[PDB]
Amino acid sequence: LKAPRLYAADQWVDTTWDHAMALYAGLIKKTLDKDGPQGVFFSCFDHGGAGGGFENTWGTGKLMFSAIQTPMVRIHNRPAYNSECHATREMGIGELNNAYEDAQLADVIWSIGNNPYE
Amino acid sequence: APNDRITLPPANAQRTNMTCHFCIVGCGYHVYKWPELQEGGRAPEQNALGLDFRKQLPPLAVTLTPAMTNVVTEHDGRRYDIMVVPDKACVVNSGLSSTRGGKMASYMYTPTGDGKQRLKAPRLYAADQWVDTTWDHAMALYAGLIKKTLDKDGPQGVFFSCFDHGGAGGGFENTWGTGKLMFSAIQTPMVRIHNRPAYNSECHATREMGIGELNNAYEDAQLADVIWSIGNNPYESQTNYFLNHWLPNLQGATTSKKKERFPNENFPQARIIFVDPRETPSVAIARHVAGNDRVLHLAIEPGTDTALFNGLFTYVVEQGWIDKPFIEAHTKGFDDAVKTNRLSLDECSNITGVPVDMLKRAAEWSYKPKASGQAPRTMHAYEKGIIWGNDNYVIQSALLDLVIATHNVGRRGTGCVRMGGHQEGYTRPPYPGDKKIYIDQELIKGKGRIMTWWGCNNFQTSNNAQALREAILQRSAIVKQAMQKARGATTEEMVDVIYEATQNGGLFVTSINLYPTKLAEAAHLMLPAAHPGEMNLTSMNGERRIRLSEKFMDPPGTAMADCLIAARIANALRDMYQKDGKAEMAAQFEGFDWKTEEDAFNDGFRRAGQPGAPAIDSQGGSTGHLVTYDRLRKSGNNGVQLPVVSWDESKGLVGTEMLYTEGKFDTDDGKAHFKPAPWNGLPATVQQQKDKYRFWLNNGRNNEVWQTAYHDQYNSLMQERYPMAYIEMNPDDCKQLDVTGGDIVEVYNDFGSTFAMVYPVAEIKRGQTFMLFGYVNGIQGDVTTDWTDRNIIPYYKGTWGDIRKVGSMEEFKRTVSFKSRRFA
Amino acid sequence: EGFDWKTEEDAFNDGFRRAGQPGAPAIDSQGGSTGHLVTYDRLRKSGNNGVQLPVVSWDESKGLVGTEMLYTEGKFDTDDGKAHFKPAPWNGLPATVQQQKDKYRFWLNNGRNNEVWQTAYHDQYNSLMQERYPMAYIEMNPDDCKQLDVTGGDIVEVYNDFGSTFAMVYPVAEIKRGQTFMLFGYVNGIQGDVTTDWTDRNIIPYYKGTWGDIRKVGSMEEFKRTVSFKSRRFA
């Protein structure tokens, strides 16, 4: 993608960024003004690397949560605003608790629900 | 890859013949093919080009760029260099390559090149997603639906829009295969043509008057005193005819040859007259070449051609600048046409807007006797400005009347000819119905169970295209929704589900193509086809010169020649009918036992007019059987002009240079027939748009872009130059709308809405515009009307609309040239 | 053109009586296309009973004959003659209204009083009306009243993010805690100041959907002397 793309009713065309923002922000604004945030939905990455990361998760999160203030947000891999690791975290154990060096120091490695070579 | 060298073909490289894939002119090319890890040396005898690359080459020595090279990967996995370059010894082009034909190498299929997205296998929209499917399953579904439709609704339920043309995505094998399938086997009349919404001709009037539209040789353009280009932008649309034949005439390089043929005839400097509302690159280039004094631009009001030709005809008759012995011996209806078509110069001028002096001059140059006594040799060339003009049938009536009265058919250096679009390659059974049917209107109105687009894309190229797409997308959606409920169905059950959805407004859509295209937005089934070079293919150019394009590489995946796709469908349908114990229906699907494209050439072109043959309409005529692949190979890219007159092993194919030179026309009596040509103004549908909206929405070709840009859309240079369809606008009009080059506008009227990037052009008249037709980004046809002439020929050049600024595309400003395309 | 009218009957002829007639422009009329059967004189002869529209026939002997109930044949005013069901989503209160509810205490219900007509354009000049309702009133729950130290004839400000207005307090036992009812449209204390800008898809306001707070201004002794604050719910 090199420029904004618009489906103008019956065909794909290019459009300008200003037009795209007029249409997109205009709809969000209209929805906020008449329905409030509950009318504006997102499914958004929450991850790192390409298509994520600390800059990007902040930008999107600030936009969705602090500015628009919509709760109608799901995550790239799961259909609500939730965690993969509710239980371990609630038990007091955040899911990334070691180093890769620990895999070198182990007597035994369990690989559970996991195909790590691939 | 590296942009600063090329791999030369080895001295011993394989070399095959190829006609350009694209426009009517049909320039000759050679394809050099050799293993990837070999190359030629720079010394001239150590490369296949015979050129000396040990030092700089002079101008005209070669046409060679990286875009003219590629590396293909064949079905055996081995990689071969190819180089596709123009043939210096071909009479058509004399080693010229247009910017379009020049890219053929780049547009051959390779896994990583511009052809990367070529269709390689059947694609199925299985209700909610695109997947691959087998050929067997695809045929079971497609033939299964055709069979069910035939069984319950008859042929009237099976619709096609199919190419009827030559070159790539057409030609004699392919038009026969498709025509036999549609007309002799299925026997559906629900068939339109790639460029027009019924089963009709662009040239009903000239044909009915006895003058087939391709009646001369390209050499005639060299021998003419005067060339008319009517509704035609030939530098851009028939480049190498214009460059290699027309211009040499204007430059004086053909004067010797005229004088050698006609010892006692004056030949003044040649002149050129353009009848075109718009000042085009062709007009500008003609003026640079010949000077302003030898070019007449009759910048008529849109849609006024009939009035122009009636005024000219009236005048040459009143002046006596006609051939009375010719009229008396070889024509019928003259006296009647003088009365019906009478129009004064003053009235002509008022309607057309051309000043009287310019009308007189055009007549003086073209028809007033030369000092030596003979009439000028005036070749009248025309194309889509009048074929898609204000009443196709009447314009041609008006023009041909002028031509016949002035004896400008059948004499060397004359002709009243189509310039052409695609190449020609038609061999078909007769159309099986007795009426013209406006196919798009029928589809919009909810008729048909199954529609196949076959080597066309009317999403981009229909008239009133927005109405078409709206309807097809909706009808397509009904079928997708119905398919959605299925789980675990047999092919036969799925046929039933789809058939039922078509009783509820649905339409099953198939596309048979090189590429997905915009049709993929609605299609349920897409089948992969093969283009020239992946198959043998025959076709003829605008002077009827038939050539063989030789196969030299494999198609992508399981892509097939269109004629063999037609055989596949026929044989599927036959098996289904045999299996259902229906011997009589099965037999309708006989005659497709084909292994190779040559089988289709033998069954079609070469059977026409032969004993015990069915009725066959063929541009080859009844001597078509004298042409074989082997004989065409021996002819080379010079081929033969059709019809063939004789053949023997020692003299090869000998054909026909010019038609009608004995004064016998294609009518019952052998005479040419004049016709009345009434001036009725614009059609009401079009006049209403003109009354409501500001801009004439002229449309047509750009030199660099081929058609619906099915290849060019993947070419990074093409997309950088023309990222969006452009609209030429007068600069004063631009300032009024606060737009400049690289802004995006909406163009709209009562028929639809589309978009374009603004291209200020000083030469465009106030209140007129010109938009690129057919493109992938901003479809022009949305704003064309539904209006057609008596034979369902659209007035594609006849529409008006308003223009609204969307915004400035800064990226276009930074990357696209908005500089003048009119050379001076 | 088309306003050469000397009397109101001219406008009846030009409008109601032309609807659906030959050569007539497009006209939307509750009379329908049989409107031309109605004339002043025929209405006079009908008396105060008139005729239920649409008129189905007329003649001098039977007068206007009209339509009692619509849709008794099962043919509805749609393309296909059927009645069409529609989806009806529950989305709670509009955000704009919910925000006032979240910020403020009282549901500010509003509407009619039996004795008062509309914006009181006549009633404001009527000395009996003005004695009985000198100021717009607000029905309040008596327990809510005690909490705010107000009784009948006190003056309160009613306000929220949209505006501020005033009312005289009318304790009403039947009002629910947290709810109120103020006379709308009135000449002394305009209720609409505190209604929101929110409308449905066709710009229909939720006039009955607003919340606000209530603040005592003071005791209007004159209202206490002259106005009944007795119950308007008959038993």
Ligand SMILES: Nc1nc2c(c(=O)[nH]1)N[C@H]1C(S)=C(S)[C@@H](COP(=O)(O)OP(=O)(O)OC[C@H]3O[C@@H](n4cnc5c(=O)[nH]c(N)nc54)[C@H](O)[C@@H]3O)O[C@H]1N2
């Ligand atoms: N407004 C407006 N509309 C016009 C015109 C105009 O002047 N104004 N011009 C009209 C004219 S003259 C024409 S020719 C039409 C063009 O209308 P179309 O025929 O719809 O357009 P093309 O680009 O020629 O379509 C060729 C299609 O076939 C595919 N293809 C190419 N090679 C092959 C092959 O070997 N096999 C198969 N099966 N498919 C192949 C391409 O990928 C592409 O999708 O548009 C017409 N429409």
Ligand SMILES: Nc1nc2c(c(=O)[nH]1)N[C@H]1C(S)=C(S)[C@@H](COP(=O)(O)OP(=O)(O)OC[C@H]3O[C@@H](n4cnc5c(=O)[nH]c(N)nc54)[C@H](O)[C@@H]3O)O[C@H]1N2
């Ligand atoms: N570069 C390139 N060349 C091609 C093609 C392509 O896509 N690209 N397509 C090919 C095909 S399939 C075809 S059909 C041909 C078409 O080739 P042409 O017909 O030459 O090209 P067009 O641009 O469609 O239109 C020709 C001219 O008609 C003029 N015109 C418009 N309205 C009228 C009118 O009322 N009267 C008259 N007298 N003139 C009018 C326009 O101003 C335009 O200059 O080109 C072929 N060659």
Ligand SMILES: Nc1nc2c(c(=O)[nH]1)N[C@H]1C(S)=C(S)[C@@H](COP(=O)(O)OP(=O)(O)OC[C@H]3O[C@@H](n4cnc5c(=O)[nH]c(N)nc54)[C@H](O)[C@@H]3O)O[C@H]1N2
């Ligand atoms: N005395 C008198 N009669 C009049 C008028 C007048 O000014 N004075 N005006 C006339 C006019 S123009 C009109 S429009 C009519 C109006 O006549 P009605 O609509 O009957 O009267 P209102 O008092 O506007 O409101 C009706 C009821 O709506 C209830 N209500 C409030 N919110 C809701 C809600 O969310 N849901 C439900 N289901 N009920 C709710 C209120 O408690 C109230 O009793 O009266 C007409 N008649």
Ligand code: F3S
């Ligand atoms: S190179 Fe091709 S596009 Fe036409 S002018 Fe020649 S046949």
Ligand SMILES: [Mo]
């Ligand atoms: Mo064409």
Ligand code: NA
């Ligand atoms: Na559109």
Ligand SMILES: [O]
């Ligand atoms: O064409």
